[PDB]
């Protein structure tokens, strides 16, 4: 049985992307400090321990699942699109996610808020005419007070409906005070939608929408994600495990149940 690792994860021959201090999801939404991972690509994406978000407090229900779908696709290729928001103020941002000189937010997201006196009943539609699936990512904002709710979106209680021809998610914000994070008792909630060719993404809302900036090109799940604090070395090795590289010469390995590449069976 193979029962020992070098201890390092060899940089060759699979394209290994070290996220350093960004997890995948943070690099995906576009946490200011993961701006470097933009449009990046990999076979194996290793998430370290350091990893800490550092932008608007958010929670992703169905995280581990959304995390895996992206990890598999192995590309982080974002494609901006021409969304048309008429009647609201775009580019919203905050101090909990500073960028440049001040207020910032997730690069891949667009915070809409009222335009002076009002927040119209938004209702855009964007058709997927292409020959590949689209993975839009959006969010809903939950102010922690009815004051905040009204300052930003006017309406006393918002709603976000993101429908395609086969689905229909209608989430409604939930006002209340959550634990303080980077000075905030507020939060955003990340949701997603994959649009199959010949389908139409339809965003209708009248409050709290945290609009998509475009879509993520999705290829076929050949790549994978893995958490490990293993160093990365310059060497050639085919079987990668959270513990490091282990040779695939023996038929059974007992090092770890998680591995990448032509590996010995786990025992």
């Amino acid at each position: 049985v193979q029962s020992s690792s070098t201890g390092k994860i060899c940089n060759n021959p699979h394209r290994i992307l070290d996220g350093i201090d960004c997890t995948l999801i943070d690099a995906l939404l576009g946490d200011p400090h993961c701006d470097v991972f933009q449009d990046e690509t990999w076979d194996l994406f290793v998430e370290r321990s350091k990893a800490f978000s550092n932008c608007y407090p958010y929670d992703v229900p169905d995280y581990a699942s959304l995390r895996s779908l992206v990890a598999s696709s192995g590309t982080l290729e974002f494609i901006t699109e021409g969304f048309t928001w008429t009647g609201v103020t775009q580019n919203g941002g905050s101090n909990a996610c500073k960028r440049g000189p001040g207020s910032g937010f997730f690069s891949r997201l667009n915070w809409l808020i009222k335009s002076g006196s009002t927040y119209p009943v938004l209702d855009v539609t964007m058709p997927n005419n292409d020959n590949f699936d689209k993975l839009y990512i959006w969010g809903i904002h939950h102010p922690s007070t009815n004051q905040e709710q009204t300052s930003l979106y006017v309406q006393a209680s918002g709603r976000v409906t993101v429908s395609t021809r086969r689905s229909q998610q209608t989430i409604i914000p939930n006002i209340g005070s959550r634990p303080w994070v980077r000075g905030l008792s507020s939060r955003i909630s990340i949701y997603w939608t994959i649009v199959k060719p010949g389908d139409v993404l339809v965003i209708n809302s009248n409050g709290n929408l945290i609009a998509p900036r475009g879509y993520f090109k999705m290829r076929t799940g050949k790549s994978s994600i893995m958490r490990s604090d293993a160093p990365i070395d310059t060497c050639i090795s085919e079987c990668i495990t959270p513990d490091g590289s282990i040779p695939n010469d023996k038929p059974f390995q007992n090092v770890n149940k998680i591995t990448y590449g032509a590996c010995p069976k786990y025992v």
């Epitope: 009647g87 905050s94 930003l152």
Partner: antibody
Framework: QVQLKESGPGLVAPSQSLSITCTVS????????VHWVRQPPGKGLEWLGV???????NYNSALMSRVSISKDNSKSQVFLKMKSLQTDDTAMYYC????????????????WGQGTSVTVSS | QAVVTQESALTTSPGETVTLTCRSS?????????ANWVQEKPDHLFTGLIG???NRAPGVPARFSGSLIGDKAALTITGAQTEDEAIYFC?????????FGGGTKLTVLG
Amino acid sequence: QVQLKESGPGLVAPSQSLSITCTVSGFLLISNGVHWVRQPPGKGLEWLGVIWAGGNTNYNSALMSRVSISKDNSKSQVFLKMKSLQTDDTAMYYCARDFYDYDVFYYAMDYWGQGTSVTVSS
Amino acid sequence: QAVVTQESALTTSPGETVTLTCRSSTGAVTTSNYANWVQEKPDHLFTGLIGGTNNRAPGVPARFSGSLIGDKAALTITGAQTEDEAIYFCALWYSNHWVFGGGTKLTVLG
């Protein structure tokens, strides 16, 4: 950096139509609003109206019947159009950026333009 | 919409602590009004000073402070210097309509 410049006529005769232009740089019109403030010689300032990032506008009740603010988001230009001009309109015309803080929730006029003088004389 | 009123001119000397004020015909000046304090320097080159009543704008020296003093808004130069001579305009927000004050001429006897 933020930056706003006004370019207009300088001299227009009573009963014609005033057309100033505030060309903004370093921020998008879909990200902020732009205000119009006029200062007649030896007087206080006067707020003319505002065009929000959403395009909707809000004018000063008084002059509203003659004012009209617009904008071409793709050119980074806001447009103050005044008709039925009368001598009193001689003043400095300024455009200042509308700012809103998302964390404390307050409005403010942060970036003022350099201004452009307009004399209404026949 | 309403009428913002403030001192015509005020004359201080270097060192002293002056306080321009900003009144509302329509009542007390609440936080709802977002008292804005613009500073007009020579040859009308306006500059933001304080916004939302007390939020000091970046360049603005620490010595300028925004506050509510009773039912009117205020600005307090603490230790005025000759370079504080200027017309200080107060602006009050009333429902998607701004309303400036007459402006105060501040003299700093030098």
